[model samples]
Target: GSSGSSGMTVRVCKMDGEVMPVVVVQNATVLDLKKAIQRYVQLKQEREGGVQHISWSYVWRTYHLTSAGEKLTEDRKKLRDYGIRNRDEVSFIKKLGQKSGPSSG
Candidate 1:
């Protein structure tokens, strides 16, 4: 049978300040989007002359996905169950919510 409403299109921003979007099944876990972000980020990075083909966990450690200030920290957590939906703009922020500076650790 044909499908209806393919899935939700969630927008994601990168730590580098670039924007991206992911399309996943109607009901899916956060892991897919995480991997999707990694894939797309790495994909673009390689094309843009980036040398490091970074690890998945590395990104997980450096950045965290948040929607409306709510952190998405669980691997199996459902995106739709909490925050985010079609065309939602989810931010890519530091794992730690503290300020970053040259003098700070």
Candidate 2:
């Protein structure tokens, strides 16, 4: 159980099935969680390249944070309001517009 005075830990999975644990305040909004996810991804990418960029250039707009098949779209709602519990898995799904491969024209 990640329930605590400060916050709780939730599992966030990327499109490729990469899971990461993020500690978020119970009162924080979805936007706040998205920022953390962006930071985590930025750091992860930097470590592999042996460098870092303080600015968060990798936008998370293309991804949707989902839980139990429902997409979390309300940015103003608190985590608790969404009924997000500790250890709950949130899936990061990339939208259809952003394809990985080159377009065949």
**Highest TM-score scorer:** 1
Cα RMSD for candidates in order: 4.2, 5.4
Q: Number of clashing residue pairs in every model?
A: 0, 0
- Which 10 residues in a row give candidate 1 its minimum summed lDDT? 96-105
lDDT of 2 at 18: 71
lDDT of 2 by residue, 20-89 (tens): 8877776776887887776566667777774655443444555678877666778988767787876678
What's the distance in Å from true for residue 91, model 2? 1.1
lDDT of each: 0.73, 0.71
Candidate 1 per-residue C-alpha lDDT over 1-105 given as tens digits, one digit per residue, 9 for 90 to 100: 976668777788665556788777666657878877766667777899786557767667787888786788776878887666777888777754687534335
Poorest stretch of ten by lDDT in candidate 2: 52-61
